[PDB]
């Protein structure tokens, strides 16, 4: 919960807490005003995180594809899960490998009046029980999976025609996302890698969208939030201040990697 | 009662309604205790005016219609204010504390006052954890918000408060930098200006609709609190050396706090915001 | 029974009705020794006058009216009084002890007397904690209030007693500075004057409606208690050296306490207050 | 050391600390002056405790009988041991059944420049090694011994003609010292009992002195010290104050027993 | 350093000579710090005048011949005074503390000053336990005797001090009842009058031969100590909340102590007794 | 070797002489890459210029005169400097570390270099505790004083150094507010200005006698350190995910630190003070 | 002292010389009671005749010649015999006990008697283990061999005794099947006939050279032992219920054992064998 509290400090507060990049339709960050407090950047980060889910819901046709029984795989603190439940009436099974996050997801779901439509599953992945699902959504979580196995499992729990919707960092050339990979412990692969994994399991790639330019401004706002905290928070412990300095360095390295050509922030949709 | 709670209970009177905030003196004069100057006489007077603070708050905030529904009592202490809204105004109170050992105390006294069904406790760091008590009609924070991140707190409040719902605050504010440093450092509080609160509340969709100065009306609390400590030091021959030393330190802090209260840098205010 | 309780039960027991307070002797004289002067003869007589004290208290306090409802027995000891009010007057008794070990004993005793349904135990420290037992009709404190902060206690009683309700007290009071110091220091109490109790009660919203002196009617208790102790020391060869020393100290204390009962500085009083 | 500290508060401080009654040659306590503090009574108690040892040294002819290799049996905190070492040059084996008192005896002996002439033995009693002794002294300690066994042991470690010197509470009639007995855990016996125990072991009774009147004032000063503490010490814990009240009660009971005829404070001397 | 020692060491300067007693200001004026008002500037000035207290004591007590032999330093703190008599006057010092963790500190600094052979520590409650360091020529107690039973302490001293030997005392005394209550209660001390000390010393065979008032010359210690605390609160942005709160309390205590120092009820005295 | 020390020995070792400070490049330029760009090639070059830094320091400070007696090596790391002064100049070195784990390592290393008799370890916290090591002729602090309270440190040095004795410092200083914040926050130091050091030293009784800028001669260290890290990441497939992330963070930090070395807010200085 | 040993020391002590065997009464009559019949009077008399038994044994066995060299005291109990041979005849005694708890007690006792240098303790089980104590001149077993395998014991003695050396035994023997069953079952021994001992000794290489009956001279021991027990029961009110029951059993056993001593089935014999 020390890790978690640091994440909530930056991306919260509840009820909807997101842990993924934000979407900037004009491909630029909002101009700095005279409010450059941490809170001003935190608000803007959250605004464009919501913006990513709203942009994904458009291109994915959430009204009919994400409004039934869906799996939220790698649900973080539940911000996506609550978004599909609240905004599209979906019944959501939110999957996390972190047991201490499961009551946070469920409590915020109650606070939003969708406690009946949001249930957690803790696993590393599992359960074919709990019927067949209309869809599975993975927002920046699949970098952690064995894609071949994951897609085979999905084939067993998704109805024919069901959709698999993915937002993810992909490589476009070897080592193109090494900074991302080593700092977040992900194994990014190419879009073709995901297509072949999905094909071997009975899924067809039906949509492939590049949103690299539109998500690049996230790193600028994330860097500015981190610098604002370092400049303005005198209560930081030496350890906490060192971690934020490290996060600032990684954020600059990550933004530069984002621009260097070897990385692709993509939205994918598969159909069983 | 653990040790620090027991000391609080010794000073702020017995249950069922135990208050941990300044008292309100409508005339801005300390009572003249002209015959009984015993510790208990100062204690009963402090309690009388702590209750008077809540009655005054109920008056200016229109508790009859604004605090008689389903309300959050944020930083409830030992439940004194929680029981007051429940009993005197029929409120269904969710009392929020960060001290797990205080939760049984609040619930017990609520059952003793016959309102056990309309007072429940959540043990929470500020208000960061989920709140599923349906939408709320109001939140009240009596001298607790100095411990909170105001921008985040008002954002939580905006989600669980209905439109038109009220945030009612009594608090020590600064009027200039370092204006409440003794208050801040001795109570581990982070006092901000009223405008800081309004800025944070505005950003989260609240409107300021009441902003009341009660600095001179609360200054006599410090005189009564000082006199109480002196009376105990003078009369209780059974204090341990450690306990006597803590009271002597409390006496010194009370003098410095009353001095700071008068130096112009501090405002004891009552605020009320409405959810847009 | 832990060691302290077991020694108490030897002197004042056996169950189910055990009292731990002085006894009342209407003649203000100790019964003359008969041919039986064994420890059991003095124990029976002590128990008889302890029950007698409760009977006298029920008289002057009109317990049929005032102590037959829902009452608090504050400092119930081993429940003797609690069972008395429950049995003799059909009271619904909430029995308050500072010692969790006595809590199950009192309940077991109440079962044995058939008033299990009308005796309830509470385990707190001098009433400082919530009492969710609904409004009470009365509170009785037999030799227990010497341990209490009287202004605080009466404030607590003020909230949990209905208007008109009675607070009934039997207690050692001082009538003079240091008038009960032997009692205070041997039993860890803080005896105060009747006026002190009256000021504390008035500040909380009670009126003093009855104030009875019973000093000379309780002085024989110390004579019988002394004689019980001497008879155990004279007759019981199974005593350990430690238990024998403890009884020798009790004997000395009983004589010093009885002397102090007579020096004029102490009063054994019955008070009644009404909210 | 809580027990010990309470004893040192009343009878100390070092280097010479005595735990026995005091001797008052005129058989009355000094008049109370306007100093009735605990310290004034403590000083007077210690003065007459020293007085008891000086009176015993006279009647026992300490110059020649207590100036060689002696046993101090039941040495308390060593006040007697240091007295014989310092005042008569004796080499002293100080015997205690309390191991934590043995460094107190030895340290105060060093402080008095007689550390070479004072050695402790911890036992419950023992050691025939450490040669034969010229004498054994027991000041208010023998009430705790099996006198028959004790005297048999002494016969094995004392030279012929060696002296055994005893200050003790004796009974003069059954139950005559019951208060003393039960409060201090002693078993007082008659002088004849000690004589027969000693005779069976080869010791002859050569001196038998009654000092009951001369020691009675000890109880008056001991009672006055206790009352002075109770009146003047506001730092006492409830437990500590109750113990002092109990000590006051016992002191009155003990003084009354002292006067009632059944108790004898005696000095005895035996010769092997 | 454990936590409370570390805080003492932070304020009373680094080793090897660390003093825990008031400072002496011969002119009774606080130094005017007219350019450098940093925490370190007040610290060095406090230390300068603590050393000046020992030099003044050495002067009035004739340390050259009275404190240059085998002496007891009773309640030695962290050894500052112990090292001073050993270095500046060649004394063989038996340093007595009631804090076992301070014994290694004193011995270490004595070895660093090259006097490790002439400074030894005994860890003792007051002076009740045996003292076999042969007869002593003097005992010195700098602001430690307020913790002692004086009648007993002087009786111990009478046994281990040679005839003509000196007891040298610096201490806060009362001049009237409750004259040092803030001092007493905040430091767990039991201050008595000078006459009380003389009575206790007389009963044990000591004669009073020097009785010096130094109250006004020590009052500036409290001003410098107050300024030091203020400077740290104003400048050390790295204090924890707990540590900052303790310093704020120390600041309040220092103001009240300096106030008590001036109210007439307290005397900072230097006494010297001689064994008859 | 605990985990942190083992990773340090991988980069700067092997023993017996291991330095933990920047290296000195007289040309102010990094050596051009040859055909060998394995981690070991950069490690050797880094070690060569770390030794070079000590050789330069011994030069400007006249160690044959000033650092050949009884000296304190304050913050000795893994003893590289301590062994240097002992070996190259026959010093009697008292080696001070804040980490008891390095204490036996330095001693084992000194044995291996034959100066076991002239290297002694002390395990304290920033010199705050007694130093019974007799008067010292000098104290050397290579990149260690950033951790210290400078007024206190210099006061301590004032007591344990003979008059004339030298305090020899290599350190990152600010030349501007927040000029070394990346260094400060990544290494937990508190860099101050040279004037700050000078004020602290003067208050304790030292004079500043030498003040040398070496910023540009130490900038290549960050280039070689960066390249070492890249070469390990590119070539070592046995790394755990955790160790790989740690090295990726070190790489980023090395670039940020080298950028800051160049921004003009930081100075790598050599000072000498004389008591 | 553990509990069993402490009760033994109460009856037969005090130190330093404590015997645990019957006593010898030359008149074959118990001393007539004097006016002193306290437990201590019987204890002294019992101790006197236990010493007397050893004096008689030293006589018939010529200890000045045969028991003044290097001897084994097999089953030394609390060392009374061991100290006797060491003191009265200057023997170098190797003291063998089956109970390690008695080993330090015997040594402490020997120090107290000044024969610490001539008394040595061995802690084995009935001599079954190596005895590196050089050739022994004699072995003495006072009431201890009843616990032994006699053929094995005598074989062991055969190896560790010089030719001519003496084995000296005092023991309860049967003169009839089941003649000492009370003794056997109460003390856990296996008494055998003198012929059994003689056969076992002859098989190992010993000749029987002395065979003395002492049954009637030891019968008074049981009378004095009985009387000691009665006097403790009659006079000692500090006894616990458990210790009082233990003494009542000892009293009954002492009477049954004394009756059996008289029934003719048991012999208290002194034997001497020579290798
Ligand atoms: N996996 C298939 C759809 C399965 C349809 C089964 N009815 C695609 O392509
Ligand atoms: N306690 C009562 C009135 C008694 C007098 C108190 N002012 C109500 O009703
Ligand atoms: N115990 C004897 C003295 C023993 C003498 C031995 N030489 C008396 O009477
Ligand atoms: N520290 C030197 C003098 C340098 C200047 C300090 N005032 C001495 O000797
Ligand atoms: N044991 C002796 C001889 C005795 C007879 C045994 N055969 C040898 O020598």
């Amino acid at each position: 919960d020390d890790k978690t509290a640091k994440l909530v400090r930056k991306y919260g507060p509840g009820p909807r807490i997101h842990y993924h990049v934000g979407y900037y339709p004009s491909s630029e960050a909002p101009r700095h005003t005279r409010d450059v407090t941490p809170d001003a950047f935190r608000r803007s980060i959250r605004l464009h995180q919501e913006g990513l889910l709203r942009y994904a819901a458009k291109i994915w046709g959430a009204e009919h594809r994400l409004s039934g029984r869906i799996l939220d795989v790698g649900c973080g603190l539940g911000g996506g899960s609550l978004f599909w439940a609240q905004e599209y009436g979906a019944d959501v099974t939110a999957v996390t490998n972190a047991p201490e996050h499961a009551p946070i997801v469920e409590g915020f779901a109650r606070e939003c009046g969708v406690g009946g439509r949001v249930r957690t599953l803790v696993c590393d992945h599992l359960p074919l029980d709990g019927g067949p699902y209309d869809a599975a959504v993975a927002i920046e979580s699949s970098g952690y999976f064995d894609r071949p196995v994951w897609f085979e499992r999905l084939a067993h729990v998704l109805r024919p025609g069901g959709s698999v919707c993915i937002e993810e960092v992909f490589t476009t050339r070897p080592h193109g996302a090494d900074v991302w990979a080593e700092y977040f412990y992900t194994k990014p692969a190419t879009v073709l890698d995901y297509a072949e994994a999905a094909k071997a399991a009975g899924f067809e790639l039906v949509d492939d969208v590049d949103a690299t330019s539109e998500t690049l401004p996230f790193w600028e706002e994330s860097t500015a939030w981190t610098k604002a905290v370092l400049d303005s928070d005198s209560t930081l412990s030496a350890v906490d201040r060192r971690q934020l300095r490290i996060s600032l360095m990684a954020n600059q390295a990550l933004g530069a990697e984002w621009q260097a050509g070897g990385l692709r922030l993509g939205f994918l949709r598969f159909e069983r």
Side-chain angles (χ1 to χ4, degrees), chain A:
Chain A
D1 181 276
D2 180 286
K3 204 68 218 68
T4 301
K6 279 169 194 187
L7 190 155
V8 177
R9 178 177 184 178
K10 180 166 179 184
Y11 297 107
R16 303 227 285 250
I17 303 177
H18 313 292
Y19 191 52
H20 51 76
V21 301
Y23 189 85
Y24 297 75
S26 66
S27 291
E28 46 183 33
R31 182 175 232 264
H32 293 19
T33 68
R34 291 254 159 69
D35 185 358
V36 292
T37 66
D39 285 312
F41 294 105
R42 174 177 60 77
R43 287 183 193 102
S44 187
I45 291 174
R46 290 153 55 72
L47 171 64
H48 295 90
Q49 284 176 314
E50 292 275 344
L52 182 138
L53 298 171
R54 270 153 29 221
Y55 170 74
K58 183 166 91 203
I59 67 168
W60 289 341
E63 195 49 65
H64 49 96
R65 296 196 189 90
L66 284 183
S67 52
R69 292 132 279 142
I70 69 185
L71 277 157
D72 193 19
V73 192
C75 64
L77 279 68
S81 301
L82 271 38
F83 180 89
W84 306 120
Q86 281 185 299
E87 307 296 329
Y88 292 92
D91 175 272
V92 180
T93 301
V95 179
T96 166
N97 68 339
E100 68 281 14
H101 292 165
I104 296 165
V105 176
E106 267 165 350
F108 282 144
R110 291 195 291 274
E111 176 180 327
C112 300
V114 297
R117 280 135 62 178
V118 178
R119 155 193 86 154
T120 54
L121 261 178
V122 184
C123 57
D124 279 59
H125 314 350
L126 226 229
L128 306 90
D129 80 53
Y133 299 88
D134 300 307
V137 53
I139 304 298
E140 239 165 87
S141 58
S142 74
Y144 296 105
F145 310 151
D146 184 340
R147 271 71 63 161
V149 172
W150 184 52
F151 274 113
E152 282 174 28
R153 308 271 334 193
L154 293 193
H156 275 140
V157 313
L158 254 63
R159 68 169 175 79
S163 272
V164 177
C165 305
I166 291 163
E167 177 266 357
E168 195 53 72
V169 161
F170 306 91
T171 49
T172 68
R173 64 177 175 249
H175 307 288
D178 273 4
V179 175
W180 170 274
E182 297 171 348
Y183 185 72
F184 296 118
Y185 301 131
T186 58
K187 197 230 91 63
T190 71
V191 171
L192 179 61
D193 295 323
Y194 276 59
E196 319 257 46
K199 190 198 208 203
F203 290 94
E204 307 299 320
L205 182 57
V206 300
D207 194 22
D208 174 1
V209 169
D210 180 359
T212 307
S213 289
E214 289 85 350
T215 58
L216 169 65
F218 169 81
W219 297 107
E220 171 184 347
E221 299 221 280
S222 175
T223 297
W225 179 90
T226 313
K227 183 190 190 303
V229 175
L230 291 167
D231 290 334
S232 64
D233 190 338
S234 63
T235 77
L236 300 175
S237 64
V239 180
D240 290 340
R241 175 170 288 280
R242 175 168 185 271
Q243 276 174 210
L244 286 164
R245 167 66 52 187
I246 287 169
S247 182
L248 197 173
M249 292 180 296
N251 267 265
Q252 295 168 326
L254 287 154
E257 187 167 68
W258 220 261
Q259 297 165 268
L263 185 152
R264 169 191 185 101
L265 196 289
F267 294 85
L268 300 184
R269 197 166 60 80
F270 298 85
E271 296 197 356
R272 180 161 193 267

